[PDB]
């Protein structure tokens, strides 16, 4: 029924990479900004290293390992890549560094400077990665603006696959109704989450259903209520979100369709999003935690035979 998964999982020596700074902390683990030099080859790769702070807990490791298994098995420009695993006292995940951080943080921080062309483009990129997930048959089960990371302001990537699962087999606000009521997840259910994600970007990081109980949420959706149209949004952009939130999953648009629609819009962005001073805005040595190296290469340019 299924093809063999012939992805390579790479084991790395601790000496190979160094941790420079702490990006985030808490719960099971903390993730570090880092530099990785691979073996014999003389290149330096910027990495995000995530490791379990609380030593080893036998229950805990399954989640970290599963994340690695899924990450290794994916190759796409708009999906985040796992370089290696380090089997120390604590399992360590070495991943490509997304220098500009969380997409959700980014829109909130830069809302004054984010143009329509960037927004439509981000929408296209997320759909492309998500469609790739669909080709895989993997389901994100947790797609949100928070789970998209930006490598350059013009290039974002889907992330947080730890909960990811194969088709067949909490972020209640992002969840589809079929997921809330019946714990059912499908690529189409994923599409609904994509719509909430699009809404977050359009609203520049606003919180959906703010001040609403999750307990409340199923009824509201059952009621047929949905998220409001964003001020920047034209009816054409808003309608796409609405289709994503339709109760009948098959009725909802496919990611492959979503890529098509957003691109057409991206072709003439001002028509579909109206934002004050759209024309004016601009969005971004240059390496941190090291002075020495100009041998740096992005993970993306670093390929493995």
Place of tokens 């469609």: 131
- Nearer Cβ to ligand F62 (52/246): 52
**Which structure tokens are listed for 64?**
């970290």
CB of 47 to ligand F62, least distance (A): 8
Candidate ranges 10-18, 23-31, 233-241, 272-280; the one touching ligand F62 (CB under 6 A): 23-31
Give me the DSSP letters along 81-143.
-EEEEEESSSEEEEEE--TT-BHHHHHHHTGGG--HHHHHHHHHHHHHHHHHHHHHTEE-S--
Answer yes or no whether residue 217 interacts with ligand F62 by CB under 6 A. no
Residue with the CB atom nearest ligand F62 in the bound state:
102
CB of 271 to ligand F62, least distance (A): 30
- Nearer Cβ to ligand F62 (24/242): 24
Give me the DSSP letters along 206-225.
PPTTTT--HHHHHHHHHHT-
Closest to 157 (Cα-Cα) out of 91, 244, 94, 99: 99
Cβ distance 48 to 31 under 8 Å? Answer: yes
Candidate ranges 69-77, 95-103, 195-203, 233-241; the one touching ligand F62 (CB under 6 A): 95-103
Q: Is 142 a catalytic residue?
A: yes
Closest to 135 (Cα-Cα) out of 127, 144, 123, 145: 127
Distance separating alpha carbons of residues 214 and 216, to the nearest angstrom: 5
- Nearer Cβ to ligand F62 (120/158): 158
Near ligand F62 by CB under 6 A: residue from 23, 163, 172, 293: 23
Answer yes or no whether residue 98 interacts with ligand F62 by CB under 6 A. yes
Candidate ranges 56-64, 99-107, 173-181, 208-216; the one touching ligand F62 (CB under 6 A): 99-107
- Nearer Cβ to ligand F62 (23/260): 23
Catalytic one of 135, 142, 190, 295: 142
Answer yes or no whether residue 143 interacts with ligand F62 by CB under 6 A. no
DSSP state of 301: G
Answer yes or no whether residue 85 interacts with ligand F62 by CB under 6 A. no
- Nearer Cβ to ligand F62 (73/234): 73
Distance separating alpha carbons of residues 28 and 83, to the nearest angstrom: 21
Distance separating alpha carbons of residues 87 and 12, to the nearest angstrom: 8
Contacting ligand F62 within 151-210 (CB under 6 A)? 159
Closest to 281 (Cα-Cα) out of 266, 270, 267: 270
Q: Interface residues with ligand F62 (CB under 6 A)?
A: 23-24, 31, 33, 48, 50, 80, 95, 97-99, 101-102, 104-105, 146, 149, 159
Give me the active site residues, please: 142
């Amino acid at each position: 029924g299924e093809a063999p998964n012939q992805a390579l999982l790479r084991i790395l020596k601790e000496t190979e990479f160094k941790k420079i700074k702490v990006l985030g902390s808490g719960a099971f683990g903390t993730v570090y900004k880092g530099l990785w030099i691979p073996e014999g080859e003389k290149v330096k790769i910027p990495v995000a290293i995530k490791e379990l702070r609380e030593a080893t807990s036998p229950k805990a490791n399954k989640e970290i390992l599963d994340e690695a298994y899924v990450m290794a098995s994916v190759d796409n420009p708009h999906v985040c890549r796992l370089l290696g695993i380090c089997l120390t006292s604590t399992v360590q995940l070495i991943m490509q560094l997304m220098p500009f951080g969380c997409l959700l943080d980014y829109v909130r921080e830069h809302k004054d400077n984010i143009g329509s062309q960037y927004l439509l483009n981000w929408c296209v990129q997320i759909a492309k990665g998500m469609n790739y997930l669909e080709d895989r048959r993997l389901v994100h089960r947790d797609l949100a603006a928070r789970n998209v990371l930006v490598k350059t302001p013009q290039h974002v990537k889907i992330t947080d696959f730890g909960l990811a699962k194969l088709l067949g087999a909490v972020p209640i606000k992002w969840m589809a109704l079929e997921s809330i009521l019946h714990r059912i997840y499908t690529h189409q259910s994923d599409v609904w989450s994509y719509g909430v994600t699009v809404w977050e970007l359009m609203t520049f990081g606003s919180k959906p259903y703010d001040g609403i109980p999750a307990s409340e949420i199923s009824s509201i959706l059952e009621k047929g209520e949905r998220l409001p149209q964003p001020p920047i949004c034209t009816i054409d952009v808003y309608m796409i979100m609405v289709k994503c939130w339709m109760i009948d999953a098959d009725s909802r648009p496919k990611f492959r369709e979503l890529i098509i629609e957003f691109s057409k819009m991206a072709r003439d962005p001002q028509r579909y999003l109206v934002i004050q001073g759209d024309e004016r805005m601009h969005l971004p040595r240059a390496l941190m935690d090291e002075e020495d190296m100009d041998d740096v290469v992005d993970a993306d340019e670093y390929l493995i035979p």
